[PDB]
Write a protein that binds this DNA or RNA. Sequence first.
DNA 1: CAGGATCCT
DNA 2: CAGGATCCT
Lengths: 178, 174
Amino acid sequence: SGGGMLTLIQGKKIVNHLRSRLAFEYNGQLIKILSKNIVAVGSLRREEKMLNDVDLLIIVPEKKLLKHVLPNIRIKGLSFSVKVCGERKCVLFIEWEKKTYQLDLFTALAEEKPYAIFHFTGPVSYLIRIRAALKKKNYKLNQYGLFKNQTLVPLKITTEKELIKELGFTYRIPKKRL
Amino acid sequence: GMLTLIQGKKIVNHLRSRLAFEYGQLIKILSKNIVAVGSLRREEKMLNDVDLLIIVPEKKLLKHVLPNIRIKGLSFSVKVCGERKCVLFIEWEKKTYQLDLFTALAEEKPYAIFHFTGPVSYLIRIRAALKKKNYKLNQYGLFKNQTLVPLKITTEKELIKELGFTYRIPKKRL
DNA sequence: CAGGATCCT
DNA sequence: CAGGATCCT
Ligand SMILES: Nc1nc2c(ncn2[C@H]2C[C@H](O)[C@@H](COP(=O)(O)OP(=O)(O)OP(=O)(O)O)O2)c(=O)[nH]1
Ligand SMILES: Nc1nc2c(ncn2[C@H]2C[C@H](O)[C@@H](COP(=O)(O)OP(=O)(O)OP(=O)(O)O)O2)c(=O)[nH]1
Ligand SMILES: [Mn+2]
Ligand SMILES: [Mn+2]
């Protein structure tokens, strides 16, 4: 909200800096968050020229760690403060090159990954259309899975691309989703 | 600000004839559709606020009742306001007090009254007991496997006894 | 469309 | 225990 606007390139340099610097405390132990479990989402992934904030999705190996990842987040040698922080969303105000920016951290479990990536990539208008179409065929789609009568629909997929095509829609790269 | 029980009762009495909503038309809220709930109904000597449940004749009016609430002969402001809860800061005498307005549909009335009467500790026990027999109780109804359990009850007393619990007057619930 | 964190009810 | 309003995501 109050955070400064970033250029796409500014955002990419922040993500790159953070890729090696995130960690969390787990019952005392300090566990590094692997760069490969950090997916850049939001307008940055859609490669928009200006961004209101930086959105990172964190992929967590086991459900037991959800309690601990965002609520005990750490960033090596970066000045920041917490706006709000639960298990699924944490909003930080970070200091970067003498400016204050909003950094949004989200968590997905490994089995949720492609649904999460699809959700947090957006844009909002695109997701409303996609979900409404699935709603007319009696499905509910969210960031956790595809559902039918409050029951998980177990799709045999791994990637976002595979998800979208399994949902019965045309795949477009993030940049071309409107 | 904190109220005595009697202060609270005089506020409710004043408001009983003064609530209305728009909606183009201005519709009076009947005193008989206004139930005092919360610690006032439990007759606690001191209260943190005044809680009133408003009973709505039809579901189509939910959109309009609290979101277009009006009070004749009173100065106030809205804190927050949705279809189910509206919180007002009212001027009474020479003081500011919190007034909480809740809505229940007619078919929900006894569930709402039971919920908003409390106290919280009592409701947690009651609901946990029903949870062990696979029911869910809330302010809207009694449910089983995401299906409304159609008890044909009218009053709160009838509800509690139908739920299989001992009826106690609000003052003695704990 | 769908859901999350906060601070309540 | 179970859920609501606000302002986000
Ligand atoms: N389903 C759904 N998802 C949303 C909604 N708002 C945001 N999201 C998801 C998709 C977004 O790409 C992601 C990040 O939200 P942001 O508000 O940061 O928007 P985005 O990053 O797209 O642009 P911006 O930060 O404004 O440059 O969260 C919503 O109303 N519904
Ligand atoms: N199920 C449930 N009901 C609640 C909860 N908190 C409040 N309520 C309901 C029952 C309460 O009697 C009613 C009014 O809440 P209040 O916070 O105003 O407490 P109460 O009025 O009993 O005392 P006070 O207002 O503090 O004098 O709302 C809760 O956590 N769970
Ligand atoms: Mn963003
Ligand atoms: Mn109260």
